[PDB]
Amino acid sequence: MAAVCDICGKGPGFGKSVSHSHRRTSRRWDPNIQTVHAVTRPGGNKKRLNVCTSCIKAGKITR
Amino acid sequence: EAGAKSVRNLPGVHILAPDQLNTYDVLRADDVVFSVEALNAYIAANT
Amino acid sequence: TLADPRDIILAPVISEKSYGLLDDNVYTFLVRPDSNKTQIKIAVEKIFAVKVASVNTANRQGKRKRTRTGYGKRKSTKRAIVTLAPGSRPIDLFGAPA
Amino acid sequence: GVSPGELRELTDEELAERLRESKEELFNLRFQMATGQLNNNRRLRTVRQEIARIYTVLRERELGL
RNA sequence: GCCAGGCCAGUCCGCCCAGGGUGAGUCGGGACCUAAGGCGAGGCCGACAGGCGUAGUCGAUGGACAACGGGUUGAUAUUC
RNA sequence: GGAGCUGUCAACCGAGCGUGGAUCCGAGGAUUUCCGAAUGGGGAAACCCAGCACGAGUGAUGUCGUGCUACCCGCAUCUGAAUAUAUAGGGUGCGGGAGGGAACGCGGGGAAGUGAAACAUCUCAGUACCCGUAGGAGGAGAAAACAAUUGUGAUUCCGCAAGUAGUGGCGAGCGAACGCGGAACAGGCUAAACCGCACGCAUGGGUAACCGGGUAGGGGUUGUGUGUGCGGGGUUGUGGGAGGAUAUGUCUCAGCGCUACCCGGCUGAGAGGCAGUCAGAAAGUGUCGUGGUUAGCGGAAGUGGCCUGGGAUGGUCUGCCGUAGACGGUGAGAGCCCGGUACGCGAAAACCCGGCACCUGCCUAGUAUCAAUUCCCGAGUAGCAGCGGGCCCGUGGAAUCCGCUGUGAAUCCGCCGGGACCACCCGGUAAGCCUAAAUACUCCUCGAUGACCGAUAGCGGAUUAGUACCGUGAGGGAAUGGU
Ligand SMILES: [Mg+2]
Ligand SMILES: [Mg+2]
Ligand SMILES: [Mg+2]
Ligand SMILES: [Mg+2]
Ligand SMILES: [Mg+2]
Ligand SMILES: [Mg+2]
Ligand SMILES: [Mg+2]
Ligand SMILES: [Mg+2]
Ligand SMILES: [Mg+2]
Ligand SMILES: [Mg+2]
Ligand SMILES: [Mg+2]
Ligand SMILES: [Mg+2]
Ligand SMILES: [Mg+2]
Ligand SMILES: [Mg+2]
Ligand SMILES: [Mg+2]
Ligand SMILES: [Mg+2]
Ligand SMILES: [Mg+2]
Ligand SMILES: [Mg+2]
Ligand SMILES: [Mg+2]
Ligand SMILES: [Mg+2]
Ligand SMILES: [Mg+2]
Ligand SMILES: [Mg+2]
Ligand SMILES: [Mg+2]
Ligand SMILES: [Mg+2]
Ligand SMILES: [Mg+2]
Ligand SMILES: [Mg+2]
Ligand SMILES: [Mg+2]
Ligand SMILES: [Mg+2]
Ligand SMILES: [Mg+2]
Ligand SMILES: [Mg+2]
Ligand SMILES: [Mg+2]
Ligand SMILES: [Mg+2]
Ligand SMILES: [Mg+2]
Ligand SMILES: [Mg+2]
Ligand SMILES: [Mg+2]
Ligand SMILES: [Mg+2]
Ligand SMILES: [Mg+2]
Ligand SMILES: [Mg+2]
Ligand SMILES: [Mg+2]
Ligand SMILES: [Mg+2]
Ligand SMILES: [Mg+2]
Ligand SMILES: [Mg+2]
Ligand SMILES: [Mg+2]
Ligand SMILES: [Zn+2]
């Protein structure tokens, strides 16, 4: 869901899935996009965002 | 340039530099008239 | 810039029907094809200094004609039939006595 | 027709009156042409050109003559 | 008008040329209203392209809303 | 520019203009209906209906003219809902975007027919096509590079290397680099430590022991520490910086750095030097070009005889020019009849390029030596693992490069590369930015050319040509030259 990050713009990648017969079909590598109700100042109003777990793991945004 | 212009539009006359001589033009001409320094330059370029 | 009433009225209409309506004191003009009835009435009153009872209008499409291989069309026109108030001075078209 | 040289002296109101009376002359010429009493048909073009001249003079006056 | 066209001929013609001819407060529509549906400010969703849709705005085949009788032209008439 | 003209199919007229310089050619300006990104609102494109303001008109409604009124984004301001801080939102005012264009660029997505004499890996082919986004070009570009015991020294493009090493149901096929020869050449700014100034939190909410350091004092409370911004400093690989000990000021003046002094340092001004519309900072005003582009003009020489002929530009006798014998026209093959050609002149104005000024900006001592203790050298990054992409390399012993997921450092005694990996050696200094030229292309405008076509040919189109006609539509698409 929502394969684009709202902070760093990280989007999906495109590649192939490869079977044992080496038959290749197109697929996608989606970023791990999770929902965040972020605030700007402490105690402020919460805004819903779609950010990746890398941005969450960094200190990019705060709940 | 003073002498090329003089014979430029004479019919049947063809002009070319000593370093551009070629078989076709020589064989089409009936007589080849060299200027003295042009002949010396052509001769020197071949030793 | 400034607007003149004479830009709305182009020419009189010269025909048997028009001449028949002159006897009734009704005048027919070719007007600019984007004017309206009220505008034409105001313009006629201002130009000819006469009272106007009512103005009737009609559009007419141009005729198609062929000249060498393909059709060509004439211009569409808008006619205005103007009837004067019962007792106003006649309009002198200066060459349309009927 | 009328010259721009002889038009560039009228101030604004003489220009506005020349414009109006020239329009009246054009109206009369149109009616005469319609009813067939006009002989010199080159008058229409001349009157149209002098009207255009008067607009040109007025416009250039109000935009940096 | 008559060399094409008209399943024949044609002096005729829905053919060819010129000119003329269509007049509305009330008729049929708009400037009034909305149906199915369409578009759709923001919006939500979607790698991009885009999908859907709120407010809104369009959309008659429906709703509301004032004219009858006679005469006249070669050609208009609930219009003159 | 200089005597005719009122375009063409395409004539017939009508009526006029012109040496007081028309028609015509060039440049700049004015006007510029309605549609169209179309943008006041609506709409079956070219139509319909408004609001506000200012004028016109009417006895007053009616009516007319001219401006403004879409949406989103950015900046600056006023306001701050539920709700308190506030924010979302709202008002105002300034800027910008949208759409089109034949090719060429970069990033992304990505076929099938076909070949493999079948077919799925593979090929076709990263092609067709699609999406995003440019510019006159673009991209790339200043070594975390190659090489190998010698060395080269940013990038791009051309020729080789080479159909080679290789790679491939080792099938059909695909296919480098090292290096060598060339075109063109160019290098520059930042982050960080540290030093100052604002805003923020603590803390003393006075023990700051700070107020340029010191030479002694006093106010003795605002010092002290950290973050976000603005200046200084700094920019390197033979490592370089920061910070310490030896050493000193583009020149002056004023102000400030607490007070008398040393050493200074900062700000402002003046005086000098240098650079400039540039990658290395940005605009604008002048003035001048033997500068250029957009109209043009001049330009030598046969009225020669005779013959044929409707006509001489042909034949045959004669004369001549040539820096001009290119080409075309004229009643038949014309250097001397005409337009021209060689050659040479020519610009109000607008635009372009160059110069000189104005103007704008930068430079207000740190150089060298020692110390080798400390700090810094681009972080969710590198590395590692999983799954993929792409490289000669089809997963293989698979290096180098790119994506997603997880895990996750170190700052020089570091880190990365040298084709698994380890040790030694060599090379380089990732995770910030900019950068001319050599290269690609032609919708278009001028000037030439063709052992190219000559009306079933050449463009589909010499003719109404994307026209007639055909199709609901996307689309398809002719034929027709000669007295
Ligand atoms: Mg999104
Ligand atoms: Mg395939
Ligand atoms: Mg990761
Ligand atoms: Mg106008
Ligand atoms: Mg009536
Ligand atoms: Mg009507
Ligand atoms: Mg007909
Ligand atoms: Mg017949
Ligand atoms: Mg018959
Ligand atoms: Mg929207
Ligand atoms: Mg919708
Ligand atoms: Mg609706
Ligand atoms: Mg409606
Ligand atoms: Mg109905
Ligand atoms: Mg009838
Ligand atoms: Mg002109
Ligand atoms: Mg012009
Ligand atoms: Mg509109
Ligand atoms: Mg609309
Ligand atoms: Mg509040
Ligand atoms: Mg665009
Ligand atoms: Mg296939
Ligand atoms: Mg096959
Ligand atoms: Mg086969
Ligand atoms: Mg441009
Ligand atoms: Mg570039
Ligand atoms: Mg700084
Ligand atoms: Mg700095
Ligand atoms: Mg001449
Ligand atoms: Mg004879
Ligand atoms: Mg000839
Ligand atoms: Mg010739
Ligand atoms: Mg002649
Ligand atoms: Mg692979
Ligand atoms: Mg590999
Ligand atoms: Mg990682
Ligand atoms: Mg090795
Ligand atoms: Mg680094
Ligand atoms: Mg770059
Ligand atoms: Mg370049
Ligand atoms: Mg053809
Ligand atoms: Mg023939
Ligand atoms: Mg059709
Ligand atoms: Zn992210």
UniProtKB/Swiss-Prot annotation, chain B:
Transmembrane segments: none annotated. It comes from the Bacteria. Signal peptide: none annotated. One of the primary rRNA binding proteins, this protein initially binds near the 5'-end of the 23S rRNA. It is important during the early stages of 50S assembly. It makes multiple contacts with different domains of the 23S rRNA in the assembled 50S subunit and ribosome. Belongs to the universal ribosomal protein uL4 family. Part of the 50S ribosomal subunit. This is Large ribosomal subunit protein uL4. It comes from Mycobacterium tuberculosis (strain ATCC 25618 / H37Rv). The gene is rplD. The chain holds residues 169 to 215 of 223 of the full protein.
From Swiss-Prot, chain C:
SUPFAM superfamilies: Ribosomal proteins S24e, L23 and L15e. GO terms for cellular component: cytosol; cytosolic large ribosomal subunit; plasma membrane. The keyword Membrane does not apply. GO terms for molecular function: rRNA binding; structural constituent of ribosome. GO terms for biological process: translation. It comes from the Bacteria. Pfam families: Ribosomal_L23 (PF00276). PROSITE patterns: RIBOSOMAL_L23 (PS00050). Keywords: Ribonucleoprotein, Ribosomal protein, RNA-binding, rRNA-binding. InterPro entries: Nucleotide-bd_a/b_plait_sf, Ribosomal_uL23-like, Ribosomal_uL23/eL15/eS24_sf, Ribosomal_uL23_CS. Was identified as a high-confidence drug target. One of the early assembly proteins it binds 23S rRNA. One of the proteins that surrounds the polypeptide exit tunnel on the outside of the ribosome. Forms the main docking site for trigger factor binding to the ribosome. NCBIfam families: PRK05738.2-4, PRK05738.2-5. Part of the 50S ribosomal subunit. Contacts protein L29, and trigger factor when it is bound to the ribosome. Belongs to the universal ribosomal protein uL23 family. This is Large ribosomal subunit protein uL23. It comes from Mycobacterium tuberculosis (strain ATCC 25618 / H37Rv).
Curated annotation (Swiss-Prot), chain D:
GO terms for molecular function: structural constituent of ribosome. The keyword Zinc-finger does not apply. Keywords: Ribonucleoprotein, Ribosomal protein. GO terms for biological process: translation. GO terms for cellular component: cytosolic large ribosomal subunit. The keyword Membrane does not apply. Belongs to the universal ribosomal protein uL29 family. This is Large ribosomal subunit protein uL29. It comes from Mycobacterium tuberculosis (strain ATCC 25618 / H37Rv). The gene is rpmC. The chain holds residues 4 to 68 of 77 of the full protein.
